Amino acid sequence: ASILIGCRRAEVARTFKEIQSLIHVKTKEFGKTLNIMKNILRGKSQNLTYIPRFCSHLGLPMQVTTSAEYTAKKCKEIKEIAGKSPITIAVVSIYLNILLFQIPITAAKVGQTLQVTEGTIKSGYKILYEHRDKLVDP
Amino acid sequence: FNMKLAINAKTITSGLKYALATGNWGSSRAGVSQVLNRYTYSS
Amino acid sequence: GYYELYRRSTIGNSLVDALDTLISDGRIEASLAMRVLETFDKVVAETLKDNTQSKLTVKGNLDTYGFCDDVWTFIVKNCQVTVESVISVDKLRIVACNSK
Amino acid sequence: SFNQFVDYTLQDIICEDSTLILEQLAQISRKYEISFGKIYVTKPMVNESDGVTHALYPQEARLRNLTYSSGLFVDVKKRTYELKYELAEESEGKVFIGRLPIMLRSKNCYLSEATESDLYKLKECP
Amino acid sequence: SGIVPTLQNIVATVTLGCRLDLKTVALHARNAEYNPKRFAAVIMRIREPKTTALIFASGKMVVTGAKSEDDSKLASRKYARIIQKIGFAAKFTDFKIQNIVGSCDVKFPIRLEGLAFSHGTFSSYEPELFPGLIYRMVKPKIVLLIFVSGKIVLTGAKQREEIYQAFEAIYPVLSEFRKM
Amino acid sequence: SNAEASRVYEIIVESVVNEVREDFENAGIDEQTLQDLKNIWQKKLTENLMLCLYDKVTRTKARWKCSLKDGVVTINRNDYTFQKAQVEAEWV
Amino acid sequence: RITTLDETVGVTMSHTGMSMRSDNSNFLKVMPKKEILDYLFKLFDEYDYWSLKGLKERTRQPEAHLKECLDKVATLVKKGPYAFKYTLRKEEERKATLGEL
Numbered sequence: 010a011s012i013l014i015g016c017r018r019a020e021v022a023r024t025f026k027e028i029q030s031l032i033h034v035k036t037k038e039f040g041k042t043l044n045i046m047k048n049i050l051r052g053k054s055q056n057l058t059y060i061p062r063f064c065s066h067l068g069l070p071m072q073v074t075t076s077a078e079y080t081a082k083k084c085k086e087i088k089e090i091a092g093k094s095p096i097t098i099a100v101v102s103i104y105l106n107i108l109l110f111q112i113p114i115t116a117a118k119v120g121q122t123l124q125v126t127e128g129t130i131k132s133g134y135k136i137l138y139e140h141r142d143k144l145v146d147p
Numbered sequence: 148f149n150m151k152l153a154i155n156a157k158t159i160t161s162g163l164k165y166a167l168a169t170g171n172w173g174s175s176r177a178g179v180s181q182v183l184n185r186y187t188y189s190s
Numbered sequence: 191g192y193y194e195l196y197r198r199s200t201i202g203n204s205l206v207d208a209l210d211t212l213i214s215d216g217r218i219e220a221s222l223a224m225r226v227l228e229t230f231d232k233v234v235a236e237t238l239k240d241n242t243q244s245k246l247t248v249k250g251n252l253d254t255y256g257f258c259d260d261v262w263t264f265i266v267k268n269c270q271v272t273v274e275s276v277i278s279v280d281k282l283r284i285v286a287c288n289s290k
Numbered sequence: 291s292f293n294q295f296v297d298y299t300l301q302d303i304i305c306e307d308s309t310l311i312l313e314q315l316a317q318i319s320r321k322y323e324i325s326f327g328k329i330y331v332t333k334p335m336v337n338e339s340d341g342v343t344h345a346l347y348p349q350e351a352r353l354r355n356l357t358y359s360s361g362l363f364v365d366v367k368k369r370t371y372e373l374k375y376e377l378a379e380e381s382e383g384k385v386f387i388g389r390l391p392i393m394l395r396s397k398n399c400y401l402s403e404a405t406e407s408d409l410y411k412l413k414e415c416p
Numbered sequence: 417s418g419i420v421p422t423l424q425n426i427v428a429t430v431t432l433g434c435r436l437d438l439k440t441v442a443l444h445a446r447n448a449e450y451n452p453k454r455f456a457a458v459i460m461r462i463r464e465p466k467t468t469a470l471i472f473a474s475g476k477m478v479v480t481g482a483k484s485e486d487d488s489k490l491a492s493r494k495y496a497r498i499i500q501k502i503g504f505a506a507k508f509t510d511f512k513i514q515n516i517v518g519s520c521d522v523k524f525p526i527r528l529e530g531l532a533f534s535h536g537t538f539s540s541y542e543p544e545l546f547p548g549l550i551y552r553m554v555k556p557k558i559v560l561l562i563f564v565s566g567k568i569v570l571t572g573a574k575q576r577e578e579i580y581q582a583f584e585a586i587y588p589v590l591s592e593f594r595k596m
Numbered sequence: 597s598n599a600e601a602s603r604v605y606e607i608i609v610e611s612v613v614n615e616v617r618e619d620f621e622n623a624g625i626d627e628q629t630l631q632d633l634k635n636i637w638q639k640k641l642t643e644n645l646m647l648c649l650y651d652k653v654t655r656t657k658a659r660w661k662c663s664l665k666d667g668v669v670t671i672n673r674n675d676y677t678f679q680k681a682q683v684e685a686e687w688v
Numbered sequence: 689r690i691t692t693l694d695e696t697v698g699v700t701m702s703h704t705g706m707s708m709r710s711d712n713s714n715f716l717k718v719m720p721k722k723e724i725l726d727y728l729f730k731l732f733d734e735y736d737y738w739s740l741k742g743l744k745e746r747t748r749q750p751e752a753h754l755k756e757c758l759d760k761v762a763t764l765v766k767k768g769p770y771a772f773k774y775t776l777r778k779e780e781e782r783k784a785t786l787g788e789l
Contacts, residue, residue, distance in 0.1 A: 094547065
């Protein structure tokens, strides 16, 4: 918990899954502890960052990354499923942006590598494809 | 058991980085590392 | 080991009736009758385990259900039963004992 | 001298003592064992705070108060015994032990292969 | 506005006043389940009002699944009668509603991140862990689950007015954070 | 109507009799008494009850599903024997 | 020789740090009281040493309940090869007394 906090407060981002890879917290128990800690901090008184980090894992060009950033902001405004957690949106946003460009990752490789269910990426892709009209930076 | 916890990278990494920063091999040796002299290309 | 539920089956009742007769009608050693039934319990179990192929499908209204002491009791009404043919039954009683 | 150390010494040091076994007792006794294989060296890289990772050319390396280094990977094969009976998980791992500083112009650094105008793009005076 | 929350589940407790033999209870009831190894209570059910009861050896009983307070007391009395009919010296006492759940639809999408930022001390929102925002209201002390779709869940109430009170209090806030 | 049933029934009678013979001989009763048991049992043999084992029982709302195994049923005066059975029933 | 990995270097680092990928390999993943007590006592004459585990396996009761009654009949030895096992100190009369109570 304290780690994930310091990540947040540091403007860095780490996924619940990632920390979950460093430590086995059982999940739900973790959420409750994190919330109580958050409450204590208030008493003592943002997906976007994830997008470049993922490119790293894929080693994608800069233009791809910034394209993905525009894509994330545009997708969040257009609403429609509200995101179903940010992680799915960040990965799908990428998958779109890359498929725009010629650079193959195909699908299963990104689903494995980034640990997103292939069905999830394709499902996100259909709805995202529908709004292809307004997501185009130039 | 999880590999990331078992292997600690800063042991080696920060170890070497430290040593070359201080230049002390241990003291058992000291001053082995020295900042380069750019006074003149000869120097 | 071996549940005694199969004694309530057509083949089980028949056995009971036969033995009861040998005991009463004759002078055939009772207690041995029990020994026989103990054998029955085991045989029906292995036979139904190793000598069956059929797969049944029962679909209908659940009139009543119940659980106590590792036994599930169901009473299905207006159901269609499929063998591997389609049969219909107004009222079917099911009694099931834990496989584990 | 540094190049010889990179090509040969890392492989030999890891190879000489790699094997370590755990002795497990039960009442049946048991072993666990981990070996170190062919080591792997990278090209020089940088980990930024956010976690974006990218190649490092020395110029920038100076300006940003960085350390010019490449990562090191090791092949870890893990085994389990039960007692010489052998089960275990293998292949599939390539493990990051730590970073190794890299001497400029050596075979590992990016500049050693550069040409004149090439160097000029990177702004390292030939 | 015009929207009033719909009650979805009422949980109540009843003291029967006498010890019970659970195998006996499970055996004699028409709609009972009892596996000591899984949970220490007979799970009994009745068709009208459609509810489920958790019956303990101490004679205490939890009744859940009702959609109205009337239905809760009704079904509770019914379960007590069943226990009596089976033969125990049970009494219908201490009927008390412990939890009321309600829900409604405001008919517009909500900006959860904005709401969480604005009402930070009462809010908890981790969309990767659970998609809804958990809002912990002070007065009345009710917990609300707020979703992007505009569907709202209110829980933790002991009285119906608290469900109604909380929604009235939250509506202006949901409006302030609408999407269209 | 089922043939597998009659076959199973036959296996049961034959199998039980031969096993029971030891005890029968021990009790010094009579081989022909054993034969009588066999003939009477088979004679008797010539109400919609299923006896079996359960692997799993589940429920979601008022929908119940059951994975039954190794059983015997009498449906409308006919007998069936099965390896597996699936029950899909809706409670109210 | 030693082989230099030539990749975009991003993939290698992603695998290094927290990758959102876990597991994929495994290494060191690591009768009523009357008849119950009477039966357990017959075991005590049958075994001068036994365990709450052996008793709980027999009686299918929590070890805590088994530990209470055993304190009355049996005593514990915590030292030696038989350590953490209860040793004893008519059996039919005790069984009939258990049946009465």
